[PDB]
Amino acid sequence: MQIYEGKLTAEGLRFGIVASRFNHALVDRLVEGAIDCIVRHGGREEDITLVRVPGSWEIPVAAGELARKEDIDAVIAIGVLIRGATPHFDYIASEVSKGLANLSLELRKPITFGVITADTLEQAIERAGTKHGNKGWEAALSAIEMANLFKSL
Amino acid sequence: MQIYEGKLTAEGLRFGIVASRFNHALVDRLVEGAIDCIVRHGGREEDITLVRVPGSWEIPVAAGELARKEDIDAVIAIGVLIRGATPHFDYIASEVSKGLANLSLELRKPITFGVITADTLEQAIERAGTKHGNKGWEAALSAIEMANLFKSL
Amino acid sequence: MQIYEGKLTAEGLRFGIVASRFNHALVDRLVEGAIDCIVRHGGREEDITLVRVPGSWEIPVAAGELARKEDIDAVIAIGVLIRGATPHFDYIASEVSKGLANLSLELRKPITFGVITADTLEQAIERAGTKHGNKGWEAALSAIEMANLFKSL
Amino acid sequence: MQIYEGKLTAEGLRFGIVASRFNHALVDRLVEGAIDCIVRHGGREEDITLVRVPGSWEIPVAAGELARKEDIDAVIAIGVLIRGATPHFDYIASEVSKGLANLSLELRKPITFGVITADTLEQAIERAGTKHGNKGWEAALSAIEMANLFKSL
Amino acid sequence: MQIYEGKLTAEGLRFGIVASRFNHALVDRLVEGAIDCIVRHGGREEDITLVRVPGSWEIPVAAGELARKEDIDAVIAIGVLIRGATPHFDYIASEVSKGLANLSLELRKPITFGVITADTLEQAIERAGTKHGNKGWEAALSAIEMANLFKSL
Amino acid sequence: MQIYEGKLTAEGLRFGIVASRFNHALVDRLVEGAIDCIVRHGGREEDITLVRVPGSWEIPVAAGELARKEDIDAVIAIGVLIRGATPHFDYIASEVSKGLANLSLELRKPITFGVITADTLEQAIERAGTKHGNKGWEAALSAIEMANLFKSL
Amino acid sequence: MQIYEGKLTAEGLRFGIVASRFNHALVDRLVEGAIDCIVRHGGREEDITLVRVPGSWEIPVAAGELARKEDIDAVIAIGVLIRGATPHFDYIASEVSKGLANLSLELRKPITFGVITADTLEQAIERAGTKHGNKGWEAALSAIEMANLFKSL
């Protein structure tokens, strides 16, 4: 049986990060987490491209631009959505997830999902570098593995 | 690390606004907000194109026409949906959000989401220039940032 | 500021109507409403093409055929869905709305949504020419405005 | 006014049926119903192609193959989904409906929806040839009408 | 009618920020927000003076020193007060607000109020770069507008 | 960006303390705390001036006298108010806080607020050298920082 | 400021694992997790020594033997304790944790704690490669970081 898997070393890999600015007190923790993951797994900070966008709605169109670059091996999408009083959250979360998933398939390049979709502020804090870990770190680790997998093929 | 971001100056930028007429007592406040944002950030009113459509359902097909214009840097979609008695709201909100998101990716051009999707009339009033701000102003600010980002690249 | 809008005169405009037969006691009121709107706004009955399909599920594939005709300026989709005992309603309503929205964007031609999606029979009667108006009339008015807008461009 | 409609005679029409095997005690009643409808409306049993697939998930990819055949006028999709204990039902029902709807538009050929999506076993029995009729018969009747409509054009 | 208003460009403007150290995990987010606002609206980071004081009580006397500088166009006061168990919060909040308001009138120079006065820790987190925005960003935007207004006169 | 801050060394600094005698069993702990803070941060006990007044009402007029001395760098106001049965507490607390805040601005000299305003005796004990620290120590630390800041300017 | 940290590459590192046999259906998942972590971070499976002991009580005395080996850089202790009906769990959990902590300090070598101490079977399953991750993987990652840190010094 032929087995393909990605290792977790980031030596030589080039990453794009697209990070939204809304809820920046939490998003900044996710970006720190993603960068720390890449560097301590052997990636170069110089090989990271970071794109900032205003809100999660804008992540896919920016991710589309990064994922089309030949010198980017994987894109990490980072943002924080917290449900408010209206149905707005539902529509944004659906379109951000759908757009990133569709781009990955269209461009045949890994795009990992480091977007917190929380019902409450507490849940978002828990997942941005406190008790339930750091979703930016997790999305970076997924991107390292997938970039390595795609090299193997 | 390469960082790309958009500044908030609108000098030289050209914008399209697509605004639905339904719930016009509120939509007109969102359009006022978007225009005020553009002008006080240094954009020219002469560089704004405004398209009026009957309802939110028609926003995407009109946005498609504006976003295909070479002299438009970003499109701001503006409308107000308020849940009624039937499931109708759900289907309209889903298709408007999906269509705008898909167009942005297909055309590789920022389209920002200034459509209120409210459960109640009060929630819509709150987001159309009262206690929870002005979603038209917010969508214009997002469009300025994204137009600048896309120039940087 | 450049402003584009559609007027509400239907002189010279050519329309397609796709109407489902299920719930025909109500759909026939919506079709009457759409035709009345077109004619009293100055359209010619001779410039209307009406396509009948069995149920709402079949509206998009028929609308696709009409919207591809060069001599059709706008398509009005008409039907009535009323929730039954199973989840069936949800799947049909989602696909009909998604298909019409997608066709409008693909073909760059207005397709208006005159499909009632009701939780109860009473709600459907209310929207088919009684206390909450006539959704066929409303969809025709939207189609007149959009056809005029698209001429202006 | 130009009116296009399909009659309910099946003389000369060729049909594909794609039927899932899961819940076969009920699906077999739907297939019987579809075939009976075609034959007693004047279709030839020899002009029916039946494709069996394991579950509803597999209906769209098989329907894609049949609907691409030049000698097939319409495809009838037949299956039975009954909600279980997990969210699984929701994901399968959504993808089966979305896939069939998308295929019909892409291939410009009628594909009718004879898939029961039931919350309970009783609801499925009711719609597979007992008190609420036979959804296979209904989907075949819809396919006859649409095949005739598409000839008219 | 003579209309005076401030635009939102910060080119050439010089700002003072007075920021308290108490609740620094949140105040540091407000200061980041204020600086980001100034810079992305075209201000120079070199034209910002930041004064740190121990607690909100000390903000006015420090703001008095900055607002008396001829090369400062506007002062942004930043701090976070969260109600504790005693009446202490009431007395501090009253004196900080009164002192800043009085200084602005005495010196005829804009001083904007970026001090969170929260009943709970959650409310303060919400307003320091999470779900209810960033009060430091808001106070900086107000200071840009007022500095521009005062130039116009 | 120009940053001004005060360090926490008290070498060379001269302080005034104004301490009320009412609730002296607790005020004496606050005065001990303030003096300990100054001395262990490097201040000389010989450089402290202590003024005793009968009650918190009299603190501002005495603080006015100390803060006008050229050889005083900062004044620490110390007292304990505990709510009694009447509205009296409210009026005293308001005037003491208002007077100290106003004096600091008028004289452009730091005056720090080491006055406990407690609803209960227990709350006052907690803040006078037990479980919630020592407000006299805290006010002295604030005065050291502000005296150093004002030197820097 | 001198900063010491460990990277997450395991190239060249040699590890000991001590794994208890009680609750082996879960412990075997933790051991799989630890080994997978080491290998995909670049460690050699040949550089792992695995010691099996009967129960968690016996982990420290075996860990003592491994941690005294000059060719072992870090020890990973793996086991699963689930509270039963008596106080037994408390005494075992206390002694296993105390013994491992004491050994690490005595031998000045990292020993990481991959022992689940669960109140219920469900909690243990959650932490042995299901919804709350894999504590063996986590303990191995900690051991890689600490082995690298200790090299740096």
Residue numbers in the entry:
A (entry chain A), B (entry chain A), C (entry chain A), D (entry chain A), E (entry chain A), F (entry chain A), ...: 1 to 153
The publication says:
In this study, we used the enzyme involved in the penultimate step of riboflavin biosynthesis as a test specimen to benchmark a recently installed microscope and determine if other protein complexes could reach a resolution of 1.5 Å or better, which so far has only been achieved for the iron carrier ferritin.
The final 3D reconstruction of AaLS consisted of 470 878 particles. This 1.43 Å map was slightly improved by Ewald sphere correction to 1.42 Å [Figs. 2(a), and S1(a) and S1(b) of the supporting information]. The half maps from Ewald sphere correction were subsequently used for atomic model refinement using the 1.60 Å crystal structure of AaLS as a starting model. A mask-normalized Fo − Fc-generated difference map was then used to identify peaks within 0.5 Å of hydrogen atoms in a reduced model, followed by manual curation which resulted in 552 hydrogens. Thus, we were able to identify ∼46% of all putative protein hydrogen atoms from the map of AaLS at this resolution [Figs. 2(b) and 2(c)]. About 70% of hydrogen atoms could be located in maps at 1.19 and 1.25 Å resolution compared with only ∼17% at 1.84 Å resolution. Finally, we observed the density for a tetrahedral-shaped ligand. At pH 7.5 the phosphate ion is expected to be mostly in the HPO4−2 proton­ation state, though we did not observe positive density for any hydrogens. The structure we obtained from a 48 h session at 1.42 Å is to date the only sub-1.5 Å structure of a complex other than apoferritin.
